[PDB]
DNA sequence: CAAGTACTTTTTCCGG
RNA sequence: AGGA
DNA sequence: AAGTACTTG
């Protein structure tokens, strides 16, 4: 929890070296990110590459190939709640436009 | 708690899970000397009884993993003698909200 | 397996998403000559026609909002805000 | 396009992950694959029952696949197989096969260590599929002995018996492609002083990981359905049709095969040698030797850029490209087919600047909006208007490209014998020429930014260049010194509503970024607006006549 | 698309074993008696015997006219014409199958009444037996409880060869004339 | 044997039907497919119950265009034959091979073989007709058949029977 | 590498920032849970200034003779003087600002002002004034029980997570916390009378204006952040290389920062 | 033109999950397979102008859908498996979270 | 417990 | 080889 | 190569 402080203390100094302003929410929201796992997680291939995420997620970045090969060895399960696993699959993404669902109502339509 | 002046042997320190329901603990006396918690750093941190964290839990519709992380090393787990599963309530000042309350499962 | 409207948390207000793909919709299916339930008042552009269809709020849609464990409450158009 | 299917359409929310068995591959290939002969059947050009359509996928475009008659864009592929005359590891597993050597029993196939050990239950408890086999292996590599008779989980004067075996086990590390183990040994209390150096054998590890207990294997990384261990070792080759080798044959006599249609034919080979080699007279030495080829044939296929040096260069110099290579980021089917595609209904040109035009609008070129096309639909709200475009034809600014039809069926308003004569039925697509007005996502690469795309108002204009006004300079980077950008066009009505909704150029003015406006006022104005606004300005009235009329919105007063 | 039914089975990959069906009551795995109706409450299997049938087809499809000149606002040989006729006001013809089912059940039918035929269901709904042994005993009509167990191969040693002769009796007093 | 089924079709309206004659078009288009209908895997589909109560659910609105998949909920008669199932029929056609009997959706076929010895085929008579010592099956004749076993065809479940063993044969 | 590690997070429906998995970073985005476009750099009165100035603007005092509000600011000015039942509600009210300057010396220790917030309040009350007319002169139509009570109440209204139990209810209470110090710094009854001058209907503006305003400002359940952060740290980082103690600073450090890199070029200890 | 990975970026930071979606697919790759259910493989040997499907291999003639996806991911999947990987696609869930 | 060996990307888009 |  | 991860001495 000071590891965190530490963390923006100095990506936010890093940022206002330069002078260039940046809103708290997204320099606390990386820290914040790198910090949940329980401690430093870098944002390299061998720290948040290596979690728990999507397979194709996952290859998306540096161990392509290499992923794939443990995905069918330990044989993981893709969520596909990942926005690369549907960028893959040619599936509208459930992000903004599509983080809900619309339907027709025939009360509603009867109604009008 | 034990308070050991240099070192506790290999010896000695297989006799720690050795005892239980009861919990045994070792902290450096050199450790000791500042108070981490009081830095200006660290913020409250809070234990929560069964009730709570399944209650944190249901209410927030979460799994026992979707929570945020504490070591079990942790500075703050150690001094407060967090057990794996326990929860901390996180309480730190916000430039953005003036008071913000996180959660950390131990593991 | 569901949220009964009575135990719904979600903004009371539509979201800038749910808005874009309401009028996305309406003016999708009013295109493909969807029935308009409104009078088009010498209207020709099925977005503009589904601008129109939503600030009367006679738009038959629902919007089934989910949330991350997934578990939904399920909201109309009707019964939705829009201060956008 | 693609003709209707009875099948009922749905989307993938899982995708499993696992190994091909090698009864799987066996059982779902339309065809093996007994000819390195890559077809000419006796050089008649046509396909040979051998390697590409022995009922495969389908080349010649003219020829429809010989199992689903579909042909060409519909049909995939069907996959084919190839029987190994001995077993080979997968390149990509050589590591794991290795690793799980290092866990269990080289003889009765049982975990080296197990519940009775105390770090051994405690890592066996580690919920992860990875995390446990980590475990499990830094403690089983150690255990160089399979465990008769282990001291009970009490006292250590009544030491009970777990499995059998009493088997000294080997000491494994690779030799490229190859491994090979060295045994503990005995004689007189120590040796080695010199042990046991064997290679073991792909035959034999096969057999030992089949008699991994599925209790077993399952607490190491694998599953007993969609990878057992016993599936790392290759006996069955899944023969790749096609549309992912294909021919590219330049003119008509002048073959053009894939990169991967020659590996495979050296498989092929490779393999008919050893089988000949050992249902033959064995000259022993010369199998174990035509083997290890067989084994560097399917590594290099899947992957040609291994440790071990020989990069197996095709006969140019040029190494064989393999499927590692295909998949492997920045370009390659992940980062550059997947995650980045080349588009339809995109637009580049030169950009200049405007004064005169509004922040959000663009200006597009005649020939850009002759060009790009948008498909509206025969609805009542625009029939005469559409049927007009059509009768405009391709070549008129305000005009259309061409006319599909409810029956899927594409009309060429360029050429068609009936672009005069067409009268439009309710249901049908005019994919008409991009008018003033119309949505449009202006981008320019790099791209760092939310607010480096944003979606534009068309305004066809005269020359060449892209105009956009000045004020949205400072969004999208970009100066107008040679400077070049991009402009996508919608398709859905509803991607039309994405775009204006949500990217609109005038909702970007204030930035999330640093929770300020993005845009501003900048140069000509910047300086000219410090000019007009000191208490020296002063203004005669013939020019505030004029320069009221210039404010569009100015109440008359 | 095609149609599907409540039973949820997530049978990945393992296909196999596609295990017979014989009167030896091992049916489906459609038709278990144990089997969930849509409101989600298990329910048993519903079995009906020629006439049982007659009488829920009949139903239906004189409800079905009901509501098809609703919303359009704003014996024997002789019942065989009648409902050759309500097939043509309510069902598109082109379901020959329901065309020769309703001929079928209306000459093969036990019993002529749905007062006539609640009470079989009465009589045969106490033995306790699998809805597929209860529907073909008062499907088809027998005499030595033999003939029955021997048509019928499921019961055997289900029932008392006297029980069964009793039942049978008592069917043949509820078979309505023709 | 007929069993009541309760089963679910998913139905993909377009936009255009977007009007109150909906719910109406929902359930015409629902028995206009699986009414009539023929699966191995619950046999002759032969009537969809209760109309007026056919359920239709919220219909999702299907992301790239304007069709509305609603997955209707619904309830109806089957006829799924299995074999051991002893079935009562008439005849439909006859041959020197055997002969097809028509049971209710479906027609069962019984080959020379699996009828006795004593009934023997006779081609001299109007119609063709199987010829026993005490008996005789023609065209119109009333034959109760225990199925041997079924082929799960097309749009047709078919059979093929046995009157040879004790107490099946004509009727 | 930031963009491809962010992705996957976003705010749900439940206002909570979460991944692929659903593992909780944030329980409400920024702390705060309001849209970044919002937000406004405004000040904290109440923060700074001397013991003796605070006391001076914010102290309605109607039991003293010199510390009570003139007649000539409210209608009630005259009948207002002395009662104790109203006095408890101006006691109330400078007591609970006397909490918020010590809280908020608890959170910015510098004394740092100037927090972005959302809603612009300022502007809120500058356009009442020509809204409404109003007259330097003339007396207010409010009450003591108007002005406290109605700030109270708009509190209330403040809405961020929505939720029925003390779980989601003392975390609103937690999100909106900081916006109310500034609100009741801005709207305490001697500056609303002293220096706004507002009206009755003014006033009643005000607040509804304030609310909407608010409920505006909040974010919008499907908001990207994870590509937004990632691109708004991302951005900035390429602007320090298109253009051009002693420690290690910029491009480089934030190469250090991201890779958690053990061996940093200048390790230093301030004591 | 290139709507490259970068591009790809700020369309999902903008929220325009349709446009994004058809400019992947629409505007570009698109391909219609046929899966079977059993095993979720692209084996389904789709004879669609006489409505016969099958998977030989599952013995499958039933349990088979049609899917639209990037022909990009149609060739990733056959270049997985011809590499022995199987990525098994259902329309199915069992996990729920 | 110590080096030693083994490994992965390194900005985006745009003519012989 | 080149361009922002 | 820069940086790290891995097993091997
Ligand atoms: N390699 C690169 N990658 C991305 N963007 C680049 C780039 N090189 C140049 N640019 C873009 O193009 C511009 C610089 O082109 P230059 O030839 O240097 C003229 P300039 O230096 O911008 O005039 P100036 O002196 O007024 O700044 C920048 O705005 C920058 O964003
Ligand atoms: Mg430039
Ligand atoms: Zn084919
Ligand atoms: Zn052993
Ligand atoms: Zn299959």
């Not at chain 1, 699959?89 to 339907?103: E, K, R, S, Y």
């Not at chain 4, 008409?432 to 690469?445: A, E, G, K, T």
């Not at chain 6, 034959?81 to 439909?92: H, I, L, S």
Request: hydrophobic share 35%; aromatic share 6%; net charge neutral.
């Amino acid at each position: 929890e000071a590891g965190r402080a530490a963390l923006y203390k100095e990506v936010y100094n890093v940022i206002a070296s330069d002078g260039s302003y940046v809103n708290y929410r997204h320099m606390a929201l990386l820290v914040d990110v790198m910090t949940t796992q329980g401690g430093l997680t870098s944002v390299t291939r061998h720290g948040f590459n290596r979690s728990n995420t999507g397979a194709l997620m996952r290859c998306s970045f540096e161990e392509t190939v290499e992923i794939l090969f443990e995905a069918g060895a330990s044989a993981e399960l893709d969520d596909c709640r990942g926005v690369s696993e549907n960028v893959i699959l040619g599936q509208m993404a459930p992000i903004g436009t599509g983080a809900f669902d619309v339907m027709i109502d025939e009360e509603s339509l009867v109604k009008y | 708690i034990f308070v050991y002046q240099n070192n506790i042997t290999p010896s000695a320190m297989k006799l720690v899970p050795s005892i239980p329901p009861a919990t045994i603990e070792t902290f450096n006396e050199a450790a000791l000397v500042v108070n981490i918690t009081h830095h200006e750093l660290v913020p409250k941190h809070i234990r929560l009884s069964s009730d709570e964290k399944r209650e944190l839990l249901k209410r927030y519709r979460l799994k026992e993993s979707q929570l945020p992380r504490i070591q079990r090393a942790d500075p703050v787990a150690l001094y407060l003698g967090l057990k794996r599963g326990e929860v901390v309530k996180i309480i730190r000042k916000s430039e953005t909200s003036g008071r913000y309350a996180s959660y950390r499962i131990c593991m | 397996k569901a949220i009964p409207k009575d135990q719904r948390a979600t903004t009371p207000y539509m979201t800038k998403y749910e808005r874009a793909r309401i009028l996305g919709t309406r003016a999708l299916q009013i295109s493909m000559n969807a029935p308009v339930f409104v009078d088009l008042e010498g209207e020709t552009d099925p977005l503009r026609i589904a601008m129109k269809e939503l600030a009367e709020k006679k738009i038959p849609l629902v919007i089934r909002r989910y949330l991350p464990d997934g578990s939904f409450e399920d909201w109309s158009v009707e019964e939705l805000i829009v201060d956008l | 396009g693609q003709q209707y299917s009875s099948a009922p359409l749905r989307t993938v929310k899982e995708v499993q992950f696992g190994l091909f068995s090698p009864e799987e591959v066996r059982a779902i290939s339309v065809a093996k694959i007994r000819f390195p002969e890559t077809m000419d059947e006796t050089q008649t050009r046509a396909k040979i029952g051998g390697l590409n359509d022995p009922r495969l996928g389908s080349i010649d475009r003219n020829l429809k696949c010989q199992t689903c008659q579909e042909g060409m864009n519909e049909c995939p592929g069907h996959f084919g197989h190839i029987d190994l005359a001995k077993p080979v590891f997968h390149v990509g597993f050589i590591a794991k096969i290795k690793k799980v050597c290092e866990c269990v029993c080289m003889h009765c196939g049982k975990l080296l260590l197990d519940e009775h050990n105390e770090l051994m239950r405690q890592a066996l408890a580690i919920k992860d599929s990875k995390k446990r086999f980590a475990a499990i292996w830094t403690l089983c590599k150690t255990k160089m002995v399979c465990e008769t008779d282990v001291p009970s989980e009490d006292d250590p004067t009544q030491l009970v018996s777990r499995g059998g075996c009493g088997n000294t086990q080997p000491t494994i590390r690779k030799d490229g492609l190859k491994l090979v183990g060295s045994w503990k040994k005995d004689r007189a209390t120590g040796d080695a002083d010199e042990p046991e150096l064997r290679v073991l054998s792909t035959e034999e590890i096969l057999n030992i990981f089949k008699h991994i207990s599925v209790k077993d294997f399952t607490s190491l990384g694998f599953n007993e359905v969609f990878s057992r261990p016993e599936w790392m070792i290759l006996t069955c080759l899944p023969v790749p049709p096609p549309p992912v080798r294909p021919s590219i044959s330049f003119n008509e006599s002048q073959r053009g095969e894939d990169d991967l249609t020659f590996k495979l034919a050296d498989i092929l080979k490779a393999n008919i040698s050893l089988e000949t080699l050992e249902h033959n007279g064995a000259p022993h030495h010369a199998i174990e030797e035509a083997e290890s080829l067989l084994q560097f044939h399917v590594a290099t296929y899947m992957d040609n850029d291994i440790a071990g040096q020989p990069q197996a260069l095709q006969k140019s110099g040029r190494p064989v490209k393999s499927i590692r290579a295909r998949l492997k980021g920045k370009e390659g089917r992940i980062r550059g087919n997947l995650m980045g595609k080349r588009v339809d209904f995109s637009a580049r040109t030169v950009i200049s600047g405007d004064p005169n035009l509004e922040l959000d609008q663009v200006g597009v070129p005649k020939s850009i909006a002759k060009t790009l096309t948008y498909p509206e639909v025969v609805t009542p709200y625009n029939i005469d208007r559409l049927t007009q475009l059509v009768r405009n034809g391709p070549n008129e600014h305000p005009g259309a490209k061409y006319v599909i039809r409810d029956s899927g069926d594409r009309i060429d308003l360029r050429y068609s014998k009936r672009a005069g004569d067409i009268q439009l039925q309710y249901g049908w697509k005019v994919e008409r020429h991009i008018m003033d007005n119309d949505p449009v996502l202006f981008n320019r690469q790099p791209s760092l930014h939310k607010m480096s795309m944003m979606a534009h108002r068309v305004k066809v204009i005269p020359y060449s260049t892209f105009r956009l006004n000045l004020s949205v300079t400072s969004p999208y980077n970009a100066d107008f010194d040679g400077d070049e950008m991009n402009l996508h066009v919608p398709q859905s009505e509803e991607t039309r509503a994405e775009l204006s909704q949500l990217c609109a150029v005038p909702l970007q003015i204030v930035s999330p970024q640093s929770n300020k406006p993005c845009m501003g006022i900048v140069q000509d104005t910047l300086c000219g607006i410090r000019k007009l606004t000191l208490r020296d300005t002063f203004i005669e009235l013939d020019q505030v006549l004029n320069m009221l009329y210039w404010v569009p919105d100015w109440d008359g007063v | 698309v095609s149609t599907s039914t409540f039973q949820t089975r997530r049978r990945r990959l393992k296909k196999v074993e596609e295990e017979e069906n014989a009167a030896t009551l091992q049916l489906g795995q459609e038709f278990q008696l144990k089997q969930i109706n849509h409101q989600g409450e298990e329910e048993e299997l519903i079995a009906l015997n020629l006439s049982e049938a007659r009488l829920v087809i009949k139903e239906a499809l004189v409800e079905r006219r009901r509501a098809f000149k609703r919303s359009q606002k704003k014996t024997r040989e002789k019942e065989l014409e009648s409902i050759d006729v309500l097939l043509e006001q309510t069902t598109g013809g082109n379901n020959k199958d329901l065309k020769n089912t309703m001929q079928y059940l209306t000459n093969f039918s036990r019993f002529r009444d749905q007062e006539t035929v609640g009470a079989v269901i009465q009589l045969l709904k106490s033995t306790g037996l699998h809805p597929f042994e209860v529907a073909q005993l008062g499907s088809l009509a027998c005499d030595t409880a033999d003939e029955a167990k021997t048509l019928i191969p499921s019961l055997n040693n289900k029932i008392s060869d006297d029980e069964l002769e009793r039942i049978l009796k008592e069917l043949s007093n509820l078979e309505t004339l023709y | 044997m007929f069993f009541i089924k309760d089963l679910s079709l998913n139905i993909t309206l377009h936009p255009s039907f977007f009007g109150p004659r909906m719910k109406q078009y929902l359930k015409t288009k629902l028995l206009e497919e699986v009414e009539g209908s023929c699966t191995g895997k619950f046999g002759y589909i032969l009537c969809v119950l209760d109309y007026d109560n056919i359920d239709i659910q919220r219909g999702r609105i299907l992301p790239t265009d304007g069709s509305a998949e609603f997955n209707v909920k619904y309830r109806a008669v089957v006829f799924k034959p299995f074999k051991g199932e002893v079935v009562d029929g008439t005849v439909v056609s006859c041959s020197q091979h055997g002969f097809e009997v028509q049971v209710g959706p479906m027609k069962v076929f019984v080959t020379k073989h699996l009828m006795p010895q004593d009934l023997t085929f006779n081609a001299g008579s109007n119609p063709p007709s199987y010829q026993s010592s005490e008996d005789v099956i023609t065209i119109k004749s009333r034959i109760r058949v225990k199925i041997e076993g079924c082929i799960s065809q097309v749009s047709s479940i078919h059979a093929i029977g046995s009157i040879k063993e004790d107490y099946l044969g004509a009727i | 590498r930031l963009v491809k590690a962010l992705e996957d997070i976003m705010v749900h429906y439940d206002n909570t920032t979460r991944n692929s998995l659903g593992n909780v970073i944030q329980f409400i985005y920024g702390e705060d849970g309001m849209d970044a476009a919002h937000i406004e750099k405004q000040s904290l009165d109440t923060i700074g200034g001397s013991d003796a100035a605070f006391e001076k603007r914010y102290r309605v005092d109607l039991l003293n003779t010199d510390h009570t509000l003139d007649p000539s600011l409210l209608e009630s000015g005259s009948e207002i003087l002395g009662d104790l039942k109203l006095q408890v509600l101006l006691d109330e009210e400078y007591k609970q600002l006397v909490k918020d300057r010590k809280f908020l010396r608890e959170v910015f220790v510098d004394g740092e002002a100037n927090w972005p917030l959302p809603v612009n309040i300022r502007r809120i009350i500058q356009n009442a004034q020509q809204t409404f007319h109003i007259d330097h002169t003339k007396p207010s139509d409010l009450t003591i029980k108007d002005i406290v009570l109605g700030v109270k109440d708009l509190q209330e209204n403040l809405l961020v997570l929505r939720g029925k139990n003390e779980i989601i209810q003392n975390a609103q209470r937690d999100a909106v916390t900081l916006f109310c110090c500034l609100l009741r710094s801005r709207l305490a009854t001697r500056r609303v009378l002293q220096e706004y001058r507002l009206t009755k209907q003014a006033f009643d503006w005000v607040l509804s204006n304030i609310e909407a305003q608010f409920l505006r400002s909040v974010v919008h359940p499907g908001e990207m952040v994870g590509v937004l952060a990632a691109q708004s740290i991302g951005e900035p980082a390429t602007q320090m290389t298109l253009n051009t103690k002693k420690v290690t600073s910029g491009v480089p450090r934030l190469k250090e920062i991201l890779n958690v890199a053990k061996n940093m070029k200048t390790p230093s200890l301030t004591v | 033109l290139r709507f490259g990975e970068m591009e790809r970026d700020c369309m999902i930071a903008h929220g325009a999950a349709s446009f994004l979606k058809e400019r992947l697919m629409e505007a570009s790759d698109a391909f219609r397979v046929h899966i079977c259910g059993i095993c979720g493989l692209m084996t389904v040997i789709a004879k669609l102008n006489h409505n016969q499907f099958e998977c030989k291999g599952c013995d499958n003639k039933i349990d088979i859908y049609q899917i639209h996806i990037p022909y990009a991911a149609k060739l990733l999947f056959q270049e997985l498996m011809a590499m022995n990987i199987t990525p098994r696609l259902y329309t199915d869930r069992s996990r729920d979270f």
